[PDB]
RNA sequence: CUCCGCAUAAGCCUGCGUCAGAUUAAAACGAACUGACAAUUAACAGCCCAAUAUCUACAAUCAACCAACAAGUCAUUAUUACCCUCACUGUCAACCCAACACAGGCAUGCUCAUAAGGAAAGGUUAAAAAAAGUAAAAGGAACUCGGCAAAUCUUACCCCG
RNA sequence: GCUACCUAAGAACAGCUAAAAGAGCACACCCGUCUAUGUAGCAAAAUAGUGGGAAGAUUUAUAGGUAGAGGCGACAAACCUA
RNA sequence: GCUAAACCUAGCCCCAAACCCACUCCACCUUACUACCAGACAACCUUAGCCAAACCAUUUACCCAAAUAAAGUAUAGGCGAUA
């Protein structure tokens, strides 16, 4: 006699069922004796809003802007734009070595970094 | 006396008797879920 | 090949044309008119 | 009621298309070709029905024997049940014994 | 819809007869 | 943020920071009488009151004192074709109290003054319809239904 | 403050409001990360304003002055997200070589279906997790029949689709004789 | 989005309109209209083209196409092949009779030759630069596609940037220097936020 | 009239709030039917509590006298670890289980006749038969299988357990 | 999730005599002796009157357990979703 | 004259050929679709009957890798049904 098709939410069931279910909000703390909630400021997300004073860009773009070709950024393109000039310069100067790719910009291990590419330990 | 009211609703009882975990606990319930998936039921478990 | 009857109208009319001066439903209902038409003949 | 009130669209049959024009060609292939090929080899259709004829039970048995391993589960089950029913009907029921 | 042309033709002729009866020509 | 995997937190560790948040809110007119310093918003489920307070204080620089949130449930009673229930989406209603005695009132976003200005544009078809209707006259009873086109 | 949630008071009540084009992927690539951040926040403010205006229009039973502005803002924000994601993916491929930022694996479920299981963040090792161990990532030899039945059902669907397409092509050729050439 | 049903009969009205919804209800199921499968490379009738009506009501009059419907291979000319309908009719006001054009199939209209007002046959031929243009088979006459009003209705010449419209120079100013750095790191360094506590290892499974 | 009523629990999930229509209510405007728009804001409840050893014989019944048997819901200590805070979910209604706007079923706290909740009669006439009541001359079980029903609120027995 | 039995932790039982009660009268509450009505009914077992129990082998809320070549049964060949 | 009647497509069936499925983001084995703590629970084992033998008890065909033929031959069987 229960609507199986309907979505099972926190508004259905007894008090325990209603209290043990959430709407998807991330936790920002933990419970301790006396049903007392302790909040963690670090677990609470902190918005990063820059200063918009003097920013010349606007939500819309004038229709007089000329059309430009679309080229999605690739790993090879990024390497050519960033690391290739320095690598070519060092190779021509003779200072190139196969052991200082980290000096050129390579990251051997993501461990020990605040922002890690894989696994991603940072938010958008 | 008067019959027809044999179904007394209870969410805890319903979920315990018929549920995803209850079905997957035993191989027979897994087969029931498989039959429902093959038939195309929108609701596989209570 | 599925075959279906298409001239049932004419088959019914071949009997109902003889049952039009009767009284009641035995001049327009085939299952009732067919028995009276045979008796009339 | 039960009869259309309008004439159906006229039906035109191309009596001289390629298929009707070349129907029956190469039927006497064995007779007029030193019997290299049999006329039954020109029949196209089910693999179990090529130069063979029989009743429903024989057709079902032949299909199960030849392509039974390649059939779907439901189709094979239905074929087995049909074979059982046909066996019972043809060996236990009827008017002439 | 049933396959056939003879029944439709015969019923069309009967309908034409009925139309002539309903609207007699001069 | 929404539909993202929050990094797991351990004792100590860094601070969880979001740089490009995808939480979009909308200031809705309250349907019932509210205090002057009270502002009502509609927000997604994944947004908490603390997150809303930080959002307002960091993006719009609005002083916030107290936030109270509730979950509003949409109606699933409607039956469309094929007798299938259609679910109106649920949302979260948030009430925010201004933190320095400021008062907010929802403005009239559709002033009749601007909606009916002196400068207006009329379609050619509409103007033709209006002119033709004005030119055409109702049939006088004394004519008795006789057409009023023939000059004779 | 709270004024940013509403459009310009002069523009309030206007039937139509002029707007420009939406930022393209190449234009956003031409800009730096900080510029993209600031533009994202500006677009977020504009999107909030447009959503508020649309909701108030629905409340007052009046048409929105310009619905296309919301679509343009959404497209611009999606393009910005695409550019940022492309940059992040390229950097990840260079530094580590992994395609995806979230670890995952190909696992067979309890129903025998091959799925992509995305790993979750935990504190205890994998073997010490009672709830994780309660999950089954293998299929016992009683699901083969159901897998075969599902495969046969999919084959039937595909055969029906192909046969219907061929019948439609034949009908089209019959109606238009000149399509034979 | 106005998701079209599997069998949605197109007509002389834009999809997702009040007229279409008064017609084309979600519960309607009509016989499909068989349409000749003209490929994108075979359709030679565009908006603004001056075509001559053949076999139609006018049967010879030349007019400009005002609307194209490739779903049913329809091109509608302006002021030609018209039937009279009462628009804006009320209980007493008979309404203003106006002529509404009926759609014409591709086979019923033939594009006129710019060289000679007589109709011509279109053959798609690529130019030296690779631009495929409609060439008259009668005398090798190039038929350029007529210019049509822009989709957004904004003329580039008659357009002044608004308060919320970025200028061309600002939109084209490239300030992106590629580097092996993330947006989060760049924003952190730009704004001056400094973090010293590292992210400890978490088990992924 | 008041069988109740109010609130919680359980159950259901927007199911008589506003506007624009009136299909429809076992008549009919009401609106419970259609579309759009609003809403229920935590203090009340749910969601709790580090480890290793260790402690816990003396009922409740106003718990004081007696009085029991069926022998009873309602405790710690030692050491180590431990600065940090107010997150999330339920809050609507004339409502649940019985195919129904069903005389049925439905756990608690308060009220004990109400401060809260409702209307037995669509209009007319007053035939038969039928149903629920009131009153009855004289007799008072003569009725009937039987004092069945109704009224008043007896005595003496027998069989079985 | 009805019902037969059991398990864990709960709840209710006005007033009167005697108080020592598987005690008596008598409400809530449980059950259903007799009559009338109803028999497609209000109800696939009900309503009205009249009845038995009502501090106990009593009634009852919640969660769990016993599954058919069986369960369970103060044996009625009971009950195990009308 | 009402109620009505009529329609031609949606698509489906049998073959042939070819060995098909798989992950925008997020969530989903606990009460599935629920961001985030100390586990150890792990699969394998003759099918039986209806029915026929006019009851029934032994018995009673169920594709197992080439169409046909050998051949319903040898052979088995309450030497019966039948295999
Ligand atoms: K026989
Ligand atoms: K409800
Ligand atoms: K007697
Ligand atoms: K009842
Ligand atoms: K028998
Ligand atoms: Mg039922
Ligand atoms: Mg119960
Ligand atoms: Mg709350
Ligand atoms: Mg509290
Ligand atoms: Mg309330
Ligand atoms: Mg009860
Ligand atoms: Mg009152
Ligand atoms: Mg009455
Ligand atoms: Mg009356
Ligand atoms: Mg008397
Ligand atoms: Mg007597
Ligand atoms: Mg006496
Ligand atoms: Mg007598
Ligand atoms: Mg009596
Ligand atoms: Mg006794
Ligand atoms: Mg106990
Ligand atoms: Mg008492
Ligand atoms: Mg007693
Ligand atoms: Mg008593
Ligand atoms: Mg007995
Ligand atoms: Mg007996
Ligand atoms: Mg037998
Ligand atoms: Mg027998």
Output the DSSP codes for G37-92. HHHHHHHHHHHHHHHHHHHHHHHHT---S-THHHHHHHHHHHHHHHHHHHHHHHHH
Residues 6+ apart with CB under 8 A from F100: F63
Centroid of ligand 12 to alpha carbon of F33 (angstroms): 30
Is F25 in contact with F43 (CB distance < 8 Å)? Answer: yes
Which subunits sit against H, judged by 3+ Cβ pairs under 8 A? A, F, G
β-sheet bridge partners, residue H111? H51
Chain A residue with minimal CA distance to F6? A123
Distance from the first to the final alpha carbon of chain F = 82
Residues H9, H11, H16, CA angle at the centre, nearest 5°?
Answer: 80
Calpha distance D74→G45 (Å, rounded): 60
Contact residues on chain A for B7, CB-CB shorter than 8 A: 1
Calpha distance F67→F52 (Å, rounded): 8
Domain of residue D71: give its range: 1-96
- Strand locations in chain A, DSSP E? 29-32, 36-39, 46-47, 60-61
Resolution as reported, in Å:
3.0
Q: Give which of F38, F59, F56 is closest to F48, Cα–Cα.
A: F56
Q: Give which of B13, B15, B33, B14 is closest to B23, Cα–Cα.
A: B33
Is D74 close to G145, i.e. CB distance below 8 A?
Answer: no
- A55 vs H: CB within 8 A: no
Method used to determine the 3D structure = cryo-EM
Residue H1 (CA) to nucleotide I64 (C1'), in angstroms, measures 84
User: Looking at the 3D structure of chain B, how many domains does it have?
Assistant: 1
G-H contacts at Cβ under 8 angstroms: 79
Does the C-beta of B46 come within 7 A of strand J?
A: yes
Is H104 in contact with H114 (CB distance < 8 Å)? Answer: no
Check contact A-F (3+ Cβ pairs < 8 Å).
yes
Calpha distance D27→D11 (Å, rounded): 30
Distance from the first to the final alpha carbon of chain H = 40
β-sheet bridge partners, residue H13? H11
Distance from CA of D72 to the nearest CA of G (A): 7
Calpha distance E12→E16 (Å, rounded): 6
CA R_g for chain C: 12
Distance from CA of G98 to the nearest CA of A (A): 7
Is G111 close to B30, i.e. CB distance below 8 A?
Answer: yes
Calpha distance F42→F71 (Å, rounded): 10
Calpha distance H14→H69 (Å, rounded): 10
Domain of residue B21: give its range: 4-46
Contact residues on chain E for C7, CB-CB shorter than 8 A: 6-7, 10
Q: Which residue has the tokens 């909040």?
A: A39
Q: How many CA atoms lie within 13 A of A115 on its CB side?
A: 22
Residues 6+ apart with CB under 8 A from F59: A47, A49, G41, G44, G45
Calpha distance E22→F93 (Å, rounded): 74
Q: Give which of D40, D58, D59 is closest to D50, Cα–Cα.
A: D40
Q: Which two tokens stand for residue B8?
A: 């007394």
Calpha distance H198→A99 (Å, rounded): 26
As to burial, measured by CB atoms within 10 angstroms (0-12 exposed, 13-18 middle, 19+ buried), residue H18 is exposed
Is G39 in contact with A61 (CB distance < 8 Å)? Answer: no
- H195 vs A: CB within 8 A: yes
Residue F74 (CA) to nucleotide I12 (C1'), in angstroms, measures 15
Distance from CA of F44 to the nearest CA of H (A): 22
Question: Which among A5, A28, A48 has the least Cβ separation from residue F17?
Answer: A48
Biggest distance spanned by C-alpha atoms of chain G: 72
Residue B2 (CA) to nucleotide J44 (C1'), in angstroms, measures 9
Residues 6+ apart with CB under 8 A from G176: H36
As to burial, measured by CB atoms within 10 angstroms (0-12 exposed, 13-18 middle, 19+ buried), residue A12 is middle
Does the C-beta of F102 come within 7 A of strand I?
A: no
- A119 vs H: CB within 8 A: yes
Does the C-beta of F30 come within 7 A of strand I?
A: yes
Calpha distance H123→H106 (Å, rounded): 15
Chain F residue with minimal CA distance to H87? F129
Residue B1 (CA) to nucleotide J17 (C1'), in angstroms, measures 38
Calpha distance H100→H125 (Å, rounded): 36
Residue B12 (CA) to nucleotide I71 (C1'), in angstroms, measures 36
Centroid of ligand 8 to alpha carbon of A23 (angstroms): 12
Centroid of ligand 8 to alpha carbon of F68 (angstroms): 8
Cis peptide before A119 (omega within 30 of 0): yes
Q: Which two tokens stand for residue B30?
A: 């897994």
Centroid of ligand 25 to alpha carbon of B6 (angstroms): 30
Which subunits sit against F, judged by 3+ Cβ pairs under 8 A? A, G, H
Check contact H-C (3+ Cβ pairs < 8 Å).
no
Is B16 in contact with B44 (CB distance < 8 Å)? Answer: no
CA G101 to chain centre: 17
Residues 6+ apart with CB under 8 A from A119: A110, G101, G102, G103, H204
Q: What residues have their beta carbon closer than 5 A to ion ligand 1? A: D 94
């Amino acid at each position: 006699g229960a609507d199986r098709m309907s979505k099972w939410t926190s508004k259905r069931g007894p008090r325990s069922f209603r209290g043990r279910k959430g709407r998807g909000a991330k936790g920002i703390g933990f419970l301790t004796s006396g049903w007392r909630f302790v909040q963690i400021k670090e677990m609470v997300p902190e918005f990063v809003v820059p200063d918009l004073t003097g920013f010349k860009l606007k939500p819309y773009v004038s229709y007089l802007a000329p059309e430009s070709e679309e080229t999605p950024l690739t790993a090879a393109q990024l390497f050519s734009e960033a690391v290739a000039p320095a690598i070519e310069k060092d190779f021509k100067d003779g200072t190139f070595d196969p052991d200082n790719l980290e000096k050129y910009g390579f990251e051997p291990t993501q461990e020990g970094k605040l922002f890690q590419l894989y696994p991603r330990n940072f938010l958008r | 006396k008067a019959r027809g009211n044999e179904y007394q609703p209870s969410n805890i009882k319903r979920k315990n008797k018929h549920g995803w975990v209850r079905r997957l606990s035993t191989p027979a319930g897994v087969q029931v879920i498989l039959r429902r998936m093959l038939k195309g039921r929108k609701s596989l478990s209570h | 090949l599925r075959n279906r009857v298409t001239d049932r109208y004419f088959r019914i009319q071949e009997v109902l044309k003889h049952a039009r001066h009767f009284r009641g439903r035995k001049n327009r209902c085939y299952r009732l008119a067919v028995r009276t038409v045979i008796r009339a003949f | 009621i039960g009869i259309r009130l309008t004439l159906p669209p006229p039906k035109v049959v191309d009596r001289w298309n390629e298929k009707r024009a070349m129907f029956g060609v190469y039927d006497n292939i064995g007779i007029l070709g030193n019997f290299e090929k049999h006329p039954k080899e020109l029949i196209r259709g089910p693999i179990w029905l090529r130069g063979w004829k029989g009743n429903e039970l024989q057709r079902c048995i032949r299909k199960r024997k030849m392509v039974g391993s390649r059939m779907f589960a439901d189709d094979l089950h239905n074929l087995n049940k049909r074979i059982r029913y046909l066996y019972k009907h043809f060996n236990r029921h009827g008017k002439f014994r | 819809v049933k396959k056939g042309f003879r029944a439709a033709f015969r019923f069309q002729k009967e309908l034409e007869r009925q139309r002539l009866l309903r609207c007699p020509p001069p | 943020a929404r539909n993202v995997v929050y990094p797991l937190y351990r004792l100590g560790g860094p601070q969880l920071r979001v740089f490009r948040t995808n939480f979009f809110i909308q200031l809705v007119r309250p349907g019932v009488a509210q205090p002057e310093d009270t502002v009502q918003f509609r927000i997604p489920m994944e947004m908490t009151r603390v997150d809303l307070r930080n959002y307002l204080e960091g993006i719009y620089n609005v002083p916030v004192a107290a936030v109270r949130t509730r979950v509003q449930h949409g109606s699933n009673k409607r039956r469309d074709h094929r007798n299938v229930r259609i679910k109106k989406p649920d949302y979260k209603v948030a009430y925010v109290q201004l933190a320095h005695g400021q008062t907010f009132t929802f403005p009239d976003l559709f002033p009749e003054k601007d909606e009916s200005p002196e400068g207006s544009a009329a379609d050619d078809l509409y103007s033709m319809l209006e002119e033709e209707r004005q030119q055409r006259q109702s049939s006088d009873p004394r004519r008795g239904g006789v057409p009023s086109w023939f000059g004779l | 403050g709270l004024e940013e949630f509403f459009d310009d008071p002069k523009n309030w009540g206007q039937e139509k409001v002029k707007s420009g084009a939406a930022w393209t992927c190449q234009q956003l690539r031409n800009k730096s990360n900080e510029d993209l951040h600031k533009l994202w926040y500006v677009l977020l403010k504009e999107r909030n304003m447009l959503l508020t205006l649309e909701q108030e229009a629905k409340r007052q039973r009046l048409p929105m002055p310009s619905p296309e502005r919301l679509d343009k803002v959404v497209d611009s924000m999606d393009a910005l997200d695409k550019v940022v994601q492309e940059r992040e993916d390229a950097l990840r491929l260079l530094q580590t070589g992994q395609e995806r930022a979230r670890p995952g694996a190909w696992r067979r479920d309890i129903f025998g279906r091959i799925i992509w299981h995305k790993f979750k963040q935990w504190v205890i090792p994998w073997h010490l997790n009672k709830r994780y161990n309660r999950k089954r990532f293998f299929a016992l030899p009683y699901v083969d029949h159901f897998l075969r039945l599902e495969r046969e059902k999919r084959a039937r669907i595909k055969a029906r689709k192909e046969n219907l397409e061929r019948k439609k092509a034949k009908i089209l050729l019959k109606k238009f004789p000149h399509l034979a050439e | 989005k106005v998701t079209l049903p599997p069998h949605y009969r197109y007509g002389m009205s834009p999809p997702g309109s009040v007229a279409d919804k008064r017609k084309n209800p979600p519960w309607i199921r009509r016989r499909p209209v068989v349409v000749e499968p003209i490929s994108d490379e075979d359709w030679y009738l565009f908006c603004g083209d001056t075509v001559e009506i053949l076999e139609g009501k006018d049967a010879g009059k030349q007019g400009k196409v005002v609307q194209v419907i490739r779903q049913r291979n329809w091109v509608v000319v302006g002021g030609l092949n018209t039937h009279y309908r009462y628009i804006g009719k009320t209980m007493d006001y008979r309404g203003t009779m106006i002529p509404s054009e009926a759609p014409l199939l591709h086979r019923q209209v033939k594009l006129v030759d710019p060289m000679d007002r007589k109709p011509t046959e279109i053959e798609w031929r690529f130019t030296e630069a690779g631009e495929r243009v409609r060439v008259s088979t009668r005398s090798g006459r190039i038929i350029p596609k007529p210019e049509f009003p822009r989709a957004d209705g904004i003329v580039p010449e008659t357009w002044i940037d608004g308060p919320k419209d970025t200028s061309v120079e600002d939109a084209l100013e490239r300030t992106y220097v590629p580097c092996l750095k993330t947006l989060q790191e760049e924003v952190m360094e730009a704004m001056g936020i400094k973090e010293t506590r590292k992210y400890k290892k978490v088990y992924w499974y």
